[PDB]
Amino acid sequence: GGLTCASAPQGTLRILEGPQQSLSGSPLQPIPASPPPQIPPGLRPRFCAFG
């Protein structure tokens, strides 16, 4: 029933789940910018002056 002590621990190892690199290599995804407001096609003078 001894349970005698031993020497000092001569190193530690830490094991953990590493993140994947292939999800880390993707280029960005910007939101596509909505265009600046354009002149709607088919505009003409609908008003002729009276008389």
Binding site: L3, T4, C5, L13
Partner: protein, 105 residues
């Protein structure tokens, strides 16, 4: 860049966490560990008490009561040995015990 063959061989080697300091001078100090009777229900797999006989004080270490640490339940503890001529880091299951000196009631 050294390597080591991971040879898992299986018993639970105890590890001690003294609430006083580091045990830096080992001497005549008797260590005995205690296990619950009823191995039927699954609580016996965690019920274990380690006792430390010194002439001055007696140190006791639990796994269940208030003050039993949470490092060996939210994380596993292993022990590497690394038989250097063979080069195999053979691994044992282990537990850490936070010992606290017993006084009175």
């Amino acid at each position: 860049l050294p390597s080591a063959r991971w040879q898992y061989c299986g018993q639970r080697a105890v590890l001690v966490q003294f609430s006083n300091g580091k045990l830096q001078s080992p001497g005549n100090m008797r260590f005995t560990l205690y296990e619950n009777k009823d191995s039927t229900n699954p609580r016996k797999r965690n019920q274990r008490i380690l006792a430390a006989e010194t002439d001055r004080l007696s140190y006791v270490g639990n796994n269940f009561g208030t003050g039993a640490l949470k490092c060996n339940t939210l994380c596993r503890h292993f022990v590497g040995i690394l038989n250097k001529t063979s080069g195999q880091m053979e691994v044992y299951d282990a537990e850490l015990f936070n010992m606290q000196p017993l006084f009175s009631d």
